Structures are given as C-alpha cells and as structure tokens.
Amino acid sequence: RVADTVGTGPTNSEAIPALTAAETGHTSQVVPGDTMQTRHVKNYHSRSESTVENFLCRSACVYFTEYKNSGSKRYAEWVVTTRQAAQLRRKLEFFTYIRFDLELTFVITSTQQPSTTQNQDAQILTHQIMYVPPGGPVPDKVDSYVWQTSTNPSVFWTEGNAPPRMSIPFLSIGNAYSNFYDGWSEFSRNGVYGINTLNNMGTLYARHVNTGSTGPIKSTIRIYFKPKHVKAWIPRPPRLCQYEKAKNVNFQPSGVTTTRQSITTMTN
Amino acid sequence: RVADTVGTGPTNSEAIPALTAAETGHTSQVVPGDTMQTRHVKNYHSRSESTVENFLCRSACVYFTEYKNSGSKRYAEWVVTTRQAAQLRRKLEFFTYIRFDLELTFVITSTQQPSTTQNQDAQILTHQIMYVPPGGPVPDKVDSYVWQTSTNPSVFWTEGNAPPRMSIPFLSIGNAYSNFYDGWSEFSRNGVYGINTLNNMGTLYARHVNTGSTGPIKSTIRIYFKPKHVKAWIPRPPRLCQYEKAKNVNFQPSGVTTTRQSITTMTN
Amino acid sequence: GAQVSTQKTGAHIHYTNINYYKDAASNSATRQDFAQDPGKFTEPVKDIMIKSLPALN
Amino acid sequence: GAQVSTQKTGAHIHYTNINYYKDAASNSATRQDFAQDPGKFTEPVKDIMIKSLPALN
Amino acid sequence: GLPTMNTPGSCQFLTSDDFQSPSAMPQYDVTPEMKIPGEVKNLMEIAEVDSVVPVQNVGEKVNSMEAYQIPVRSNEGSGTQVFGFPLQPGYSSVFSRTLLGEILNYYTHWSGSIKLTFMFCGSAMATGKFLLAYSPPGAGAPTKRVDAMLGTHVVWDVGLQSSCVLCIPWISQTHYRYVASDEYTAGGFITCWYQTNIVVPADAQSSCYIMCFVSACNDFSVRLLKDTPFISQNSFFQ
Amino acid sequence: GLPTMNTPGSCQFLTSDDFQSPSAMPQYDVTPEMKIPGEVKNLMEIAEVDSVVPVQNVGEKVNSMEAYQIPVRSNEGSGTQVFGFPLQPGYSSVFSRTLLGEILNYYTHWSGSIKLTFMFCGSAMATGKFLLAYSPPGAGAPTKRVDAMLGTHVVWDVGLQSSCVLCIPWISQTHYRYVASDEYTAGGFITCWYQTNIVVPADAQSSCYIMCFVSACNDFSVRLLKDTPFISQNSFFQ
Amino acid sequence: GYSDRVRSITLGNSTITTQECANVVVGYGVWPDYLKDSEATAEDQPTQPDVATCRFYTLDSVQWQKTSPGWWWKLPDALSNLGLFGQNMQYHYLGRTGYTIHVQCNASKFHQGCLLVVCVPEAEMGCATLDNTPSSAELLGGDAAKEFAGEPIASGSNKLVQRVVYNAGMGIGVGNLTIFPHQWINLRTNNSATIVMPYTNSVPMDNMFRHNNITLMVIPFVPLDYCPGSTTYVPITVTIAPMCAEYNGLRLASH
Amino acid sequence: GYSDRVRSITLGNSTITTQECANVVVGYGVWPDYLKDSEATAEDQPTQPDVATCRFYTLDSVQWQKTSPGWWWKLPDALSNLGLFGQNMQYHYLGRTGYTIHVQCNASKFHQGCLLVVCVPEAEM
Numbered sequence A, B: 001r002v003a004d005t006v007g008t009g010p011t012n013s014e015a016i017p018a019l020t021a022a023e024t025g026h027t028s029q030v031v032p033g034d035t036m037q038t039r040h041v042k043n044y045h046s047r048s049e050s051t052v053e054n055f056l057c058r059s060a061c062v063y064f065t066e067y068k069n070s071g072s073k074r075y076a077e078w079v080v081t082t083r084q085a086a087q088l089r090r091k092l093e094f095f096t097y098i099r100f101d102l103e104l105t106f107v108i109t110s111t112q113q114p115s116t117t118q119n120q121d122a123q124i125l126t127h128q129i130m131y132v133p134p135g136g137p138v139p140d141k142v143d144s145y146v147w148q149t150s151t152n153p154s155v156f157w158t159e160g161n162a163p164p165r166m167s168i169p170f171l172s173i174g175n176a177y178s179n180f181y182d183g184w185s186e187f188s189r190n191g192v193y194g195i196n197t198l199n200n201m202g203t204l205y206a207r208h209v210n211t212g213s214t215g216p217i218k219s220t221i222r223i224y225f226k227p228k229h230v231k232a233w234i235p236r237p238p239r240l241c242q243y244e245k246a247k248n249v250n251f252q253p254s255g256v257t258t259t260r261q262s263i264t265t266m267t268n
Numbered sequence C, D: 001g002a003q004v005s006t007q008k009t010g011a012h013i014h015y016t017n018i019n020y021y022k023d024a025a026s027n028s029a030t031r032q033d034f035a036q037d038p039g040k041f042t043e044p045v046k047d048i049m050i051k052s053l054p055a056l057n
Numbered sequence E, F: 001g002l003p004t005m006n007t008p009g010s011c012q013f014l015t016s017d018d019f020q021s022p023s024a025m026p027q028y029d030v031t032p033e034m035k036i037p038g039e040v041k042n043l044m045e046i047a048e049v050d051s052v053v054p055v056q057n058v059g060e061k062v063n064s065m066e067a068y069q070i071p072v073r074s075n076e077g078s079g080t081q082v083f084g085f086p087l088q089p090g091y092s093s094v095f096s097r098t099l100l101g102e103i104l105n106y107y108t109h110w111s112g113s114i115k116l117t118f119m120f121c122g123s124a125m126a127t128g129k130f131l132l133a134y135s136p137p138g139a140g141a142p143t144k145r146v147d148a149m150l151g152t153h154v155v156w157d158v159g160l161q162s163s164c165v166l167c168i169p170w171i172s173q174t175h176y177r178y179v180a181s182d183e184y185t186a187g188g189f190i191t192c193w194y195q196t197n198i199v200v201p202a203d204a205q206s207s208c209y210i211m212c213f214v215s216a217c218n219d220f221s222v223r224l225l226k227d228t229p230f231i232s233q234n235s236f237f238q
Numbered sequence G: 001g002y003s004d005r006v007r008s009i010t011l012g013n014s015t016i017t018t019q020e021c022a023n024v025v026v027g028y029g030v031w032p033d034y035l036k037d038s039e040a041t042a043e044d045q046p047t048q049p050d051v052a053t054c055r056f057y058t059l060d061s062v063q064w065q066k067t068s069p070g071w072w073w074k075l076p077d078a079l080s081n082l083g084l085f086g087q088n089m090q091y092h093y094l095g096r097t098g099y100t101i102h103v104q105c106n107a108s109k110f111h112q113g114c115l116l117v118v119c120v121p122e123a124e125m126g127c128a129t130l131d132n133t134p135s136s137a138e139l140l141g142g143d144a145a146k147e148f149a150g151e152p153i154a155s156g157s158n159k160l161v162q163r164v165v166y167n168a169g170m171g172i173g174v175g176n177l178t179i180f181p182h183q184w185i186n187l188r189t190n191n192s193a194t195i196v197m198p199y200t201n202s203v204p205m206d207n208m209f210r211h212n213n214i215t216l217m218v219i220p221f222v223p224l225d226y227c228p229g230s231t232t233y234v235p236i237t238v239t240i241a242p243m244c245a246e247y248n249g250l251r252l253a254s255h
Numbered sequence H: 001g002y003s004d005r006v007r008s009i010t011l012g013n014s015t016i017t018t019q020e021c022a023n024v025v026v027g028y029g030v031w032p033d034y035l036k037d038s039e040a041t042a043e044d045q046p047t048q049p050d051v052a053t054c055r056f057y058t059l060d061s062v063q064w065q066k067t068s069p070g071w072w073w074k075l076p077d078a079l080s081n082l083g084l085f086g087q088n089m090q091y092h093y094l095g096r097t098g099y100t101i102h103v104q105c106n107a108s109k110f111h112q113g114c115l116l117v118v119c120v121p122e123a124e125m
C-alpha cells in the first residue's frame, strides 16, 4: 500500500531537510511536508500493478517460422533463444540476473498456396512439435526415425481447436538465467564472446503429420513465452539504442534524448 | 417489496391530505386511502426488475467494422468510445455520473467475396484482436512488429467455436465515468468542447493471422458491452430528440410530443 | 469455500456460487440489491411537511 | 484440499484455488506478493544519515 | 480425467446471461469511491417524481410552451368540460413523453396507482371549483357532468393551498396491464368538469391556466424489459 | 458423466490469462536458489533512485556530455531565468530518457510527488542563490521572477552542503494523470530564477555548471501496463 | 406561534428576509460540507476564508415581459467578476464550493404567472449547427443573463447555442426538467424561491474556469398577464451565496 | 550534531534556506499572534486565510555599488501590488499582520563590506 502524507504547520528551525549532500551517493527522501505546509491526505492507492511478476507475466511472441506440406522446406528448425524480438528482450534486459519458469503457447495457422492442381479435397492438417535438448539427434529430413520421440517431449495438434500450451521449469546449470556475460568461452580469451556463450537451450522442430491435400498448403507457427514465478536481481538501466544482432549487444551510437527549441521552451 | 394499501372508512375531519402546495417543490405522497375508502389488499409484487443493475446489465452492440484477408484494408482500427449506438447511449444518458465494470464479447463472422480465382481451398481463419491504451504504438500496417503484444492485452480466436469474452475493470482517472462535461480542454475556454474532452480510452485493432485461401474473404467483427456492478448518480431527464453526432449532443429541435384531435379526444 | 444464497422465486431452493478468478472484477453481476431511498428526489424539502396539514400555514 | 484466499478489489469476496498437477511448476502465477525494501538501492550508505541533519558536519 | 457430458445450450452467446470471465487486465488498482450526492438505486425512485404533463397537445401547440397549459375562463354556463384523456401511461400521446411514460416505455407490464397533481396558476383574487373524475371502462367516455359524477370524483376548491392531488387507484381485473394498447386491459378515462364557475373581480384577467403533474404511488411496479420504440439510428453516428 | 455446459469465452487464447498447464518435463529437480545481492521485488524501487536529467537538450548538445550540464555565470543583472520545463515525466523530451521516464513509458497512468535534486558543480569560492519554482497550470508559463515568486518556490543558497531538493507535490484534480499528453491533465511548469547573483573572487572561473537528478517520492504509483513507443524492430534480428 | 412563510438567512455579512416564501429545497438531501481527509487528493494545504468568499452577491436584474422565453446562468462564471470569490478563483488552480440560490420576483394580487427555478448539474448545450460546437462568448455570460428563444435557431453554420426553449438547449423535454432540485414561484402565492445545491462533481476538486458545474435556469411556464392600470415592469433578481468554499494550488494571476 | 549557521524557514508554500546565517532576531521578544477577544473593538467577524496571505514574497533587487548610500522600504506599501495580500488589503478596511524580513546579499571571501538592516516603527520623514 502507498504511504500517506502527514499534516504539517509553519516551522522556523536550524535543521534543514532540503539541504543535503548528493556526493555521498544517497537519495534524500523528502516528504512534501518538509518544503511546504501539507494536509493529512490518506492514500488508498496500491503498487499492485508494478510488481516484477505482473510486469513480466504477459504472453509475448519470440519467433515465427513457416513450413510447407509439399516442397523443399517440409519441416522447420529453430534454436530456442530469446533476443530475437525487441519488445520482450528489452523487458528482460532490465535485470542482469533473472530466474523464471515458462509457459509456451503455439499459434499454428495454415493457408493455401496458389497453384494449378484441380480437384482439391482439403483434410484436417495435423501438426507435430518436437523439442531436442542439446546433444540429441536431429531430423536431417521431414521423414526420419528421430520423429518417434521415444524420450523427447512432443505435442500433436489437429487444426480446429484450442491452441497447444505447456509449462517448462527453470532449465539452467547455474542458479539463474544470466542476461549479460562479459567473458569468452576459451580461458585463452579468444573465441565466442558475450551472452552467446550461455545459450545451449536446445532446438525446436515442427512438421506436418499428414499431407493435407494435392494442392500446396503453407503453415506458419508462432511461439509465445509467458514467465511465471519470476525473481530478478541487480537492476540495470534501460536499453535506449535499437538492437542490431541477436547474438550480442552490438549497436549504433544514438543521441541521449530528442531535442527542443531552447533551454526555456515548454514545448517539444 | 412493494408496499400494501391499508383499509380506511368514511371520514369527516378538518385536516385534508389532498390539498397541498406544489410550489414548495415537494411530491405529495397520497395513498388511495386518503381520497376514497379502500380495502386491505396485500401486495406480493416486487420491484426486482427495475433495479439499475438489471436495467443496464444486458449485452448491447456498440460498433461493428470490416477487414479483408487480401486487399487495401487488411486490418481494422476503432477508437473505443460509446455514443455510436443510440440504444445503449440513450440508456446510459439517463444518469449524469455512472461507474461500472464491463464485459466484452466479439462476434466475428467471415464471408466469401465474389471473384474469378479458381481452385479455392478454404482453411480455418484465425482472428487476432489487440487493445492499444492511449500512448502506445500503432500498427501502421497489417504486418508490423507492434502485433507482438509484449505488454498489450490481446485475444486469438479460430473460427468454429464459442465467441471470445473478457472482463474489464473501471478504467478512469476520476472517480466515475462522466457522461456530460460542460467545459473546454484549454483553460483559455477555446478548444475541444463537451464530453469529447474526457474520451481517452484507447484504440482497438483486429486482423487476420493467416490468409485463409486464394479467393478474397471479408470478415466483420461486432463489439458487445455488458455493464457489471453498476452505480449511478444524479438522475437526468430522457433524451427525446434523435442523436446526430458521436462527439457532442448537437441536435435538431423537435416537438414536445405527438399531437391529437382536440383537448377532449380519448384517441390518438 | 462455497457461498450458498437464496433464489428469486414467486410468492404465495438454495443455489451455490463459487468464485474461481482472483481479480474480484470477474465475479458475476450482483442482481439482488433491492434497496431504495426515495427521500432524496421526492419530499427533499428542509422542513418536514406532514401529509394532512396546511402546507403553507 | 482447497485453498481459499482474498480477491484484489477496490478500496473505500473470497476465491477458491485447487492444485491439480503434481509437478509444482504448473501452479498459477503468484501475483499477490506486495513486499518491498528500497533500502538496497536508495540510502545504501554505511553510516545512517538522518533527514534533517548537515549531511557533512 | 473427470468424464463429463455437454448438454444442449453449450458454446452459445445468450444476451441476458450472467457468468464469470477472465479479466484482460489482472491486478488493477481501482480508483476508490467517493460520496457523490443523489445516488439512484432503483428506477422507481424516478417514477415517483412529479412530471409536467402536456395535456394541450393540439396541432401547433406542441412546438411551444403552450402545450403544458390548460386554459380555463369565466363561462356563461356550468357543467362544461375542461379536459379529458384515457389512462394509457405507456401509449397515449399525453403520457408518452412524461418521466413516468419514458420509464414505462422500457418495460412491457405495469401496475400500481397514479397521482395527478393539479396547480392553479391564476390571479390571487380569482376563485373557483372543479370536479376531477376517473371513470373505469365498461361504458364510453362521460359526456356530461351528470355522467362523470358517478365515477371516482374529487371536488377541488381554489384557495390559499393552490395544489390538489387526484389519486387514480388500481381498479383492474388482472394483476398487471400492458403498456401497449390492448382492449383486454383498457384503463379508463380521466375527465375534469367545471363545478360552479371561475369568478374574478374588476380589473383582473378572466382567463387563467392550470398545470398538471403525473407521478407514481408507493405501490408501482414494472416487468419484462423491452426496447423503446422512440430512439432510432439510420447509421452508426460519427 | 457429469453434465456441463460451455460458456462464451471457451477455447480462446487470451494474452493476460492465468491458468494451469501440464508440464512437458515431469519430476524435474530444479537447481536450488542462492543469495545474490540486490534483489528487486517492485519496480518502484528503481523509480526512487536519482537519475541524471538532460535539461540542456538543445540541438547538437544531445550528442555529448554537455546535455546534462546547466550553464550558470556571473551576470550584470538579476531576476533572469536559468531553465524551465513542463511537468510531463512520460512525454516531455527532458524526462523521457530518465529512469523514472523509462519506467513511466510502460504504464498509462501515474500519480505521486517528484523530487528534483540540484547539485552545484562550481568552484569552492563561488557563492550564489537561486529560486526554484513550481507553478501549477491555469495561466501560461511565468516570464519574470515577480510572476514565478507566487508559485511554490524554494530559495537555494550555495554553501558547504552542495545539494538542494525541490519536492514537487501532488496538486491535481484527478487521482491519476496520463503519461501521454492531454490538456485535461496538464501538469504545470518548473522554472529556476537567479536570486541575487553568482559572485567569484579573483583568479577563479565565473562560469559554473549545475546538475539535476529526478526521483519519485514514497507515494508514487503506476497503472494500466502498455507497450513502450521507444523500441522497434523491422525484422526478427538474426 | 409563528408561520412558515417567513424566513431569514444570514451569511457572512449579508442577510435575506422573505415574508411570502415556500419551504427551502436542500439539494439531494445533503447540506454542503468541507472536504474530508479520507477523500482529498491534493497534498497541499487549502485556504478557507468562509466570510469574504461566502456571502450573498446580487446579480443584474432582468425584465419579465409577456413574451419572455426564459434565462440561464452559470454559477462559477457569474460570480467570477464580483468580489474576493472572483479574485480567489482567479489566483488559484483548484476550487470547491456549494451554492445557495435565491430568486426574487414580486407582484401584486392582480398579476398572474408562474416561473420554474431549476439547478441543472453539468448542462452541456447543443450548437445550432451539427458540425460546430458553441463558443465561449455565446454559452456563458459574465454577470449577464443569456435569454432563450421561442422559435428554433437557424441551422446555418455559426457558433450560436441552440436557444429554443421547449428543448432547454440540452435536447430534452422541458417538462422532465423537474427531476433536478426545483422551485415554483407562482405570483398567486410564492414571491421568492430558495435552493441549496451541494458540490456535485465527479472529482474532489476541479478548475472553475474550464468547467461550470451548475447552470441555474428560470423558465416562465405560464406567461405573465394583467389588465391596463397595473405596473408593467416586473423585474427578476437572482442572489447567489457560495458556501464552504476552499481552494488549492496558488498560482500567478490568470484570466 | 548540527551547527547554528544553517537555518530553514517554511511558510505557506514557500521555503527559505540559509547556510551562513546568524541568530534570528524576534522583535521585542514577542512572536506575532492573532488578536485576542479581550482586546478587539470591531464587532464584525474577521477573515483569516493564513496561507495565501502568509508566504514569502520576493521583491525587486537593487545593486550595491561602492558609492551607494542606502535604501528604505514600506512593508504595507511594498506588498500592496503582489498576490492576495494586495487584493485583501485592497478590498477591506481594517488589517492586522506581523512581518518576517529576510535580506540576501552574498559575496566571496575576497569582498568586504557591512550592511545594517533595521525595522523602524512609525518612521515619519
């Protein structure tokens, strides 16, 4: 609950709250009462919306890819990593160390591709989503034994009903998801540099179980991340400069802020 | 519960309930018993239907818009405001100050547009509805990063199942939804005048997630408002004159009531 | 933690309600609040005026 | 084995929650943890500095 | 794995339904409430307020302030009629635009008493007597004072107290009546007749006016909410 | 065989929802937690930290360290203006890139007090006095010291203590204000004026600089989370 | 003992006596009161004179002819140029007050007529042309009574307010105006009308200049009549007294 | 603890901070107080805002040259054209108030000089 102001009356004392020393590195907490007379106003406002859990707990689309029922690309492959979407990456970059569980929803939408094949009879498409942890086998082809998934987790979904959704625990060899890593892979100090060192989260594949019809059909899958039970450590300043690459923090230098007319202008 | 009449018998007293003074501004509450003999009739009738909650708690369609899978208009934009539908606006105008929560249901219906493209294979259309609060980004195009919705609320809906529905709390910087505002925006007294001053509720966009087929498909979305936990203050007289604009109360003068033959006619 | 209340039936039976969502703005519409006070709009005068009395003595 | 808690409503009603999955990572997001401690970022100095005092005597 | 079974009526959008729904904005701190004067808790608190009745809605009179005035003058005879109208609050053109009528046009049924408050707006020296009458159906409307005298009538004397109340009671066969016209639930007729005359002294006007307010009694009720046939839109206003 | 009935709102994907979901990896031994210093539990713990304000954002000055410095020199007169800006934390270019501003640009509403900490960065012999002023709306901005003197003002004397705090209070008509521009919820104006002068001894520089930090008071609140209009992507970065 | 037709009202240093008056109408049952601490939002200290601000200001009088349609007044604007209430609401940002309305129109026993005095809260008024909105010089008249019109205003493009009387300008039936606190001055009995309106607004405090809450309206339902020999100039006077007035946000003079 | 050279004064919505100031002089030993009921003569009710009327008004500044003889101010007249104190003393007949006087003149360590600030009551000239 938000604090409430306390009523105050005219004062004339040597001690002065307003005058302090900002060189100490201390934020001087001054109630409006110190610099002017105030009346007792109770505050019934709450800080409920601000909490880290309510700020980060909203579904956001990390990446979307496409696959075709018949054609050169029959299966889709994506290395599961964040930093591909600016909206979520910026929100996560606020804290150096983060630790959260995750909820994943897959919005799969199909569409017909233009062709010349006649006598089309569309049938309910079925989509299989598979997750390969770092080290497992890779389906070099859309039809391969790897798709048996004797151990890997997978989800099958027929088109027409509610989207798939699963919950994922905190998968990390450390004690927190590091967002920034100022170091190299080799102790030699030569090699991969940056956060891409700590990205070994696996890969996610998707395919069509059954060929829908004779005419070509293209399906696009979108992946949504929902942080749950989130904990944040070491707060950091907000980005400011637009992102360029998804493997590092390389950027182009940009002005501190938008300019105005003069130093006494009240309008942008 | 409705009150019941009390039995009365012939009287001959100086005090007279019927004669009063209407200049005082007081409604003389006279039971039928005062002006004639009455018998004791118990009333089991109830005023349950009249209550403000039961009067305003019925779904009503505020606005409907259209978007096309392929074509110039691929996304729909609507500033969320009331006063576009006469049936609900008239009901709300009864009270100067209103305060209610809201339930929103979106009836999305698609249809095929006439064309010449052959070999059509229709696929389940998916519709995304997004709400941008006042200040957020705007999707200048149907395909844009804004549609990631990292913070904004959104709903995805595949065609074929029950319609979407969400509940919205009381969003207002004041303590009540003002229905009438006799003032300007500028303290200069020149500028926007009327209720349009207090309408900053945001915007609502909608789009097709996946192109359904080769042939053009047009979809229309209707929005329904359902007030919940409603409170009303300062009752007002009913409209009478038909509405003209959705930004003010400008009207064309109309007769008090429909006329009749004479002052002693019993028929319209 | 269920709430049992009475149903609106004719004159001259309990129903059950459980809240599932934790926002307190998702509850069903409260329809049974049959309370009134017509003293604000009718008879709003400062000095009480009894029914059978010369309103202006 | 149900858990009854309070709803987040305005100022100036209990809701029910039951866990069905046995992994403890499937529970709903805990949204009501309104606790704070701004002493770590603001006023983090070693020696306490009272408000109305010459910060550097 | 609880086995269920959907019943007829699932996955529908009923208009007047009451269910629960997940909120789009979780953990919202609602702005606290404050005390604002004049809180309404029931629409029958508005129906119990006096509303000016446009009895003289004849021709062009509806386009001026002359619709609310009922003319009364010093006559050469006695027993003539001043005005009359049927008891149709939700239908007749006389009660259609009154607050009571505006409220009634939203609900199909209605029941209870009615209170007609008449105010004489003449000079301070003009005196008179009037006979207000309510005649239930069964016959036509009364045509002469000897016929409306047999109904429910209240003689009114113009004096210091310038306000008289005519309490039209509830005399019906059914518990409720329709706001729309229906001969099965006919209301009656309200007629006002000159009792003796309107006599004035010298140098005072002999043509005065009377005003009428309509209100509901403590026992009014309404039911079956319906759309009003008054408001209409050709297209979405913008 | 329990008969149920689906309600409107089923089989939908609402973004800000909170339900339960079966885990893809059952019986996972989570890595235990450890004590890491500086745990954040609420975003208003970041808004209460002082943030350097770029008051001098004029032209090219935004592309150097000269944006955070406010120039102050020994003048030949008195009563002139040093700087001024509107109270628009989530909109004005002055508060847009401050931590407080970066936090505010995520939430539609805001309320509470503000704390402006001014630090004089001149020599050890240069003395001076300044008048900080906050004028609520109703009139334009103040143009002379006789007009900003009537607002809420705090005279500041440069001395051993080199830091002064201006507590902009909460004087508004609505419980909350919009972070976006809206004339209905105008903030006010913050203006600083020379009180007497800036006097220096011989062989000391007569042109000094002042820095400003912005922070929130113990009574700050935010509401209605929205997307920020600052970050944008043309395509998925790769 | 005594009779109910006689009343005396004292406020500040002003007094109002009436010998033929009806019962005072007290708003919606609430007597105006100061802002409590569990309802305020401005953290600044308020100023409350309660003597100079609260007193009976007498406005300009208007003539009641046989063909007069009615008049309307805005309570914040009318007193903006009269005394310390005008000076204070001018030097501050937020203001709050209730109002006492007294209307005086006296006539002999041989006159006839009837007036309706109604305090309409939040009276937004429609413009003559659908596209334009009324201007600030036509809607509110400082210490001046804006008259209505018997016939409809022209629909040609203009910023004129719709002043037709049988619609009250707000687009309603003039008959249903009774819902608001109202008084009837019939020259047969009543000679004065008193109303006490509390502070009715959707916020704790609001700026008086860009928001006029209450709009007093006087409507002559039954026209004035007389025979030759009686005085033809019958005026109408309106006295407004603020009550429980307080302010916040001291700022440089603004007009 | 603290030193005596630092002082802060709050009145209405205004504040005055000094870091090199001497001890405040309080008139003839009497702090200004409202008129008691055993001393009044006007039978009318008085008006007391105490917020708009009571606050630090800053006047115009004057330059101190090497050949400046001195300056004088009249407390009722100087504030007659500044804020609600001016508006009130203008709309009324009788007024009563005490005054707090603050004079600010700052110079470096290499300047020299001395000023006398004196409040003379009833200064007929």
Ligand SMILES: CCCCCCCCCCCCCCCC(=O)O
Residues within 6 Å of the ligand: A080, A081, A082, A102, A104, A129, A130, A131, A153, A154, A155, A166, A168, A171, A177, A201, A204, F024
């Ligand atoms: C059908 C597939 C189900 C399982 C899919 C699991 C994919 C996500 C794996 C965990 C990723 C957690 C986030 C890592 C990136 C980060 O912390 O920045």
Ligand SMILES: CCCCCCCCCCCCCCCC(=O)O
Residues within 6 Å of the ligand: B080, B081, B082, B102, B104, B129, B130, B131, B153, B154, B155, B166, B168, B171, B177, B201, B204, E024
């Ligand atoms: C998928 C979108 C979900 C959220 C949509 C919210 C749109 C409605 C916002 C609140 C509007 C409340 C009514 C304001 C108008 C009025 O009070 O007259």
